[PDB]
Design a protein around this motif. Sequence first.
Motif, PDB file in Angstrom:
ATOM      1  N   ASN A  19     -54.141  97.645  44.479  1.00  0.00           N
ATOM      2  CA  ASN A  19     -55.399  97.546  45.203  1.00  0.00           C
ATOM      3  C   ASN A  19     -55.143  97.387  46.696  1.00  0.00           C
ATOM      4  N   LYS A  48     -58.950  89.984  49.077  1.00  0.00           N
ATOM      5  CA  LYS A  48     -60.044  90.922  48.849  1.00  0.00           C
ATOM      6  C   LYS A  48     -59.651  91.982  47.829  1.00  0.00           C
ATOM      7  N   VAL A  51     -59.973  90.434  44.474  1.00  0.00           N
ATOM      8  CA  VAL A  51     -61.385  90.305  44.124  1.00  0.00           C
ATOM      9  C   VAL A  51     -61.956  91.650  43.695  1.00  0.00           C
ATOM     10  N   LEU A  52     -61.593  92.723  44.404  1.00  0.00           N
ATOM     11  CA  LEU A  52     -62.065  94.049  44.021  1.00  0.00           C
ATOM     12  C   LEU A  52     -61.532  94.445  42.651  1.00  0.00           C
ATOM     13  N   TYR A  55     -63.631  92.597  39.947  1.00  0.00           N
ATOM     14  CA  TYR A  55     -64.902  93.264  39.674  1.00  0.00           C
ATOM     15  C   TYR A  55     -64.711  94.501  38.807  1.00  0.00           C
ATOM     16  N   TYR A 214     -61.715  98.327  54.429  1.00  0.00           N
ATOM     17  CA  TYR A 214     -61.928  97.739  53.111  1.00  0.00           C
ATOM     18  C   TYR A 214     -61.711  96.228  53.118  1.00  0.00           C
ATOM     19  N   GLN A 337     -64.444 102.797  42.838  1.00  0.00           N
ATOM     20  CA  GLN A 337     -65.464 102.187  43.673  1.00  0.00           C
ATOM     21  C   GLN A 337     -65.688 103.042  44.913  1.00  0.00           C
ATOM     22  N   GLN A 341     -68.904 100.064  48.069  1.00  0.00           N
ATOM     23  CA  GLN A 341     -68.592  99.072  47.043  1.00  0.00           C
ATOM     24  C   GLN A 341     -67.303  98.325  47.360  1.00  0.00           C
ATOM     25  N   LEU A 342     -66.306  99.025  47.905  1.00  0.00           N
ATOM     26  CA  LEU A 342     -65.048  98.369  48.254  1.00  0.00           C
ATOM     27  C   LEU A 342     -65.235  97.394  49.410  1.00  0.00           C
ATOM     28  N   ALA A 345     -67.496  94.484  48.486  1.00  0.00           N
ATOM     29  CA  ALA A 345     -67.081  93.773  47.277  1.00  0.00           C
ATOM     30  C   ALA A 345     -68.252  93.632  46.308  1.00  0.00           C
TER      31      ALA A 345
ATOM     32  N   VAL B  53     -64.444  84.917  40.881  1.00  0.00           N
ATOM     33  CA  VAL B  53     -64.193  85.349  42.253  1.00  0.00           C
ATOM     34  C   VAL B  53     -64.171  84.149  43.190  1.00  0.00           C
TER      35      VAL B  53
END
Lengths: 385, 389
Positions: A19, A48, A51-52, A55, A214, A337, A341-342, A345, B53
């Motif tokens: 990622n 981040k 986290v992406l 999701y 991003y 994504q 969306q990226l 988040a 998260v």
Amino acid sequence: QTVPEGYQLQQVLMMSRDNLRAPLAVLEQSTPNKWPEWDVPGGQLTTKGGVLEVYMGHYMREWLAEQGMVKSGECPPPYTVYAYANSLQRTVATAQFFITGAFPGCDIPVHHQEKMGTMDPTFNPVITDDSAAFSEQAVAAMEKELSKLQLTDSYQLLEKIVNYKDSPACKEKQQCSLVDGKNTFSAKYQQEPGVSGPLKVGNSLVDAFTLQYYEGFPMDQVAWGEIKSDQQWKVLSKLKNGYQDSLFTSPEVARNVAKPLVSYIDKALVTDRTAPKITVLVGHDSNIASLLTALDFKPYQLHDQNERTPIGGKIVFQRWHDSKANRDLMKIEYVYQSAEQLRNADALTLQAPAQRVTLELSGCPIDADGFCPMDKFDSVLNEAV
Amino acid sequence: VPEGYQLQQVLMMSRDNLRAPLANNGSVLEQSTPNKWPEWDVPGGQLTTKGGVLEVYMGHYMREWLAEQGMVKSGECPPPYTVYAYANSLQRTVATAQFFITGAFPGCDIPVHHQEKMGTMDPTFNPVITDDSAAFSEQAVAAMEKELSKLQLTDSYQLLEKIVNYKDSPACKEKQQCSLVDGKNTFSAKYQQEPGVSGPLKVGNSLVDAFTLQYYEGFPMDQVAWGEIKSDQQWKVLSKLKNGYQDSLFTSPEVARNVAKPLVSYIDKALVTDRTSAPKITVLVGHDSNIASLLTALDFKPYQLHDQNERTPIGGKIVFQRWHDSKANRDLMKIEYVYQSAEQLRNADALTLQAPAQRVTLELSGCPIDADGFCPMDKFDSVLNEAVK
Ligand SMILES: [Zn+2]
């Protein structure tokens, strides 16, 4: 989205890459400006990015539960899910975030070889053909691939953005341009296909800018606020995509460097009638690019995305069971994504889904619903090896 | 951090993050209102994805803070037995621990330890009464009733009844109870069970807890208590019920010192030890009940969290820190509550050293805090050893 009556999803393998990471800084010599600081060392996965991946992991869990592969709220039986990542920090961390996001509270380990920091041969896109004829044809294919691209406007916009004239690489020079620079490709044995020249410089700069975008940096700290339109992002993305296409989209290079992955996929999906119902392979964008060309995928276009193999994107191979005809079918999708969306988040649910695009193999033609016969799929995989 | 101080050991007491409320047919939440509760992406009682998260962000912040104090090298995995993660054998607590560890140490092989019987309580985290004597049960209920009598909850009950439309609720259509202001509360303090309460106190706590979780999940404002909470003062009035529920059940010193005895025993063993191959960083993931009973058992001084309407918030963690004064050759204890604001929780803000999580220095009544927030290690263990006894 439409599933014909009697179809039961039986097996899924996901080809994924690392990622959002911190760039490994070409970047300093190409500009006089100061690059903004990152919270993590270069080459490591950012928070981040984790986290992406979380999701995307939750969305994949919801989709798998909707098709009856796993029961939502209960951990699948042991050995149901198999996660395998390249022995690098960002790939292992990406797998950990995805698995925890998909199966929070379960005991699903991320498998990787013991020698961390070194490439796993399965995920190592290195050249395994030492013959001179191979290297000649490989370099020719890379140059032919690059020849199709027109990058002059991209170089001009990049030079303006980075103030290339005042950079260390340009001092003592009256005229300093990346437009007229020469690119030399390399296809050495036990190494990755590479290129030196303005293509690598442009790819590194635009990749750094893409990671800044991003990561969620304020807009004035993304390329120093110089990118002002979506067309400018599109013009710059030609450099990154051209870099990736030249190195890993030529069929000669792709069929050799991606051979371990195709072998793994053919073993894990076709000759695997044994067991792993969900396989997650976390490698790199090179692995995805070479695999797409090696399996002779038809061209595809992602929506709200200027990259070919973006972060969070996953190639989901799906073996379905046609109950009426008592036959297995193959459906392949790119679940990814969008750029929005990226950066934002965004949460991914079945109501607010991740982007999905049905892919197609030249050897496995898909029906109106995106399915193709399993026997043609194994045929393509055996012909690729 | 004064010059020469070296952070040597850290234990973090945490709770489960943002979860889905259990609102099925027979539930307290369903029986207390006619309105339709907004639906969640996760089954009830499970940890939500946003909650995971939020733990990830808190995990990264704790990694940045630990690296700032020299505990771990940023970007490199600590030695194997350096980090020990231990959670209650529930889905939400184990998942919370998994998200925190991955956010703090991405790419490392740090497992979350838990007993095999998932879905069942771990004795370490189970705030049940272990004293079977009747006299203990008598005094426990008496202390709970005395503690509740001090609270004034009339305005909270009225606002809750207006918000949830309690008059038209199933609990009044078919159960003959129709007012939270005039409702009766019955406390229970039975052996091998948790101290509990029945009545409007439990109803109000469950309702306000659901609304708070809706807020943190990021639901549109019209879907948080059906849009009826319109001011921060209303949030404060509603939060009085939750704080009163927690205080009545766990602020009696006898009950808290008994139900939290296994947890205090673990912390005392895991923190005072300077042994070889012992974990330098410990993460205990339990429940808000565990934190509340722990706060009272160790006789914590009163504290105020800011930008937060809860006392033991979802993201908050109690970080025990043993520091070594190199100049004086002495060990010191510093305790902080590291938590996220309501905005940080709802907005899922990233937590970095530049944009940090909220921090409040806590203090034990038996370990008086200096000007820098430190207290001597011997007084701290003294308090802990007297509480375990
Ligand atoms: Zn085969």
